[PDB]
């Protein structure tokens, strides 16, 4: 089926961009969302888009700072994060959200990325 390959992570100052892509090399889903895990902390959802892109949603804390959008022609899933924070930092994730039945509930069957590292610091 699919394989999504992530690129544009970085080390950037804080109030700094990224533009974040996730290239899907083959097809298979319900939708698309880019996810993010610091250390210790669980796989949140911060961006999400439908197929037709007219449904975006966004984290609480990355409203206004973050674009999810999608190239159809080049099959690539983007996110645009401005004004990045250091509380920003993070391994970032996109996943293809399909489903699959567990015991007579459904579960989101994900087609995931490798993950691209972003870290926001002073150090940059």
């Known amino acids: 089926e699919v394989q999504l390959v992530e690129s544009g992570g970085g080390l950037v100052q804080p109030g700094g961009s990224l533009r974040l892509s996730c290239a899907a090399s083959?097809?298979?889903?319900?939708?698309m969302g880019w996810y993010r895990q610091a250390p210790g902390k669980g796989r949140e959802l911060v961006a999400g888009?439908?197929?037709?892109?007219?449904?975006?949603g966004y984290a609480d804390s990355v409203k206004g700072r973050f674009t999810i959008s999608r190239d159809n022609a080049k099959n690539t899933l983007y996110l645009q994060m401005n004004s990045l924070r250091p509380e920003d930092t993070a391994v970032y994730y996109c996943?293809?959200?399909?489903?699959?039945?567990?015991?007579?509930?459904?579960?989101?069957?994900?087609?995931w990325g490798q993950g691209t590292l972003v870290t926001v610091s002073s150090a940059a």
């Open positions: 996943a293809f959200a399909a489903g699959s039945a567990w015991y007579g509930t459904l579960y989101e069957y994900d087609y």
């Open positions: 083959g097809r298979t889903s319900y939708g």
């Open positions: 888009i439908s197929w037709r892109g007219d449904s975006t």
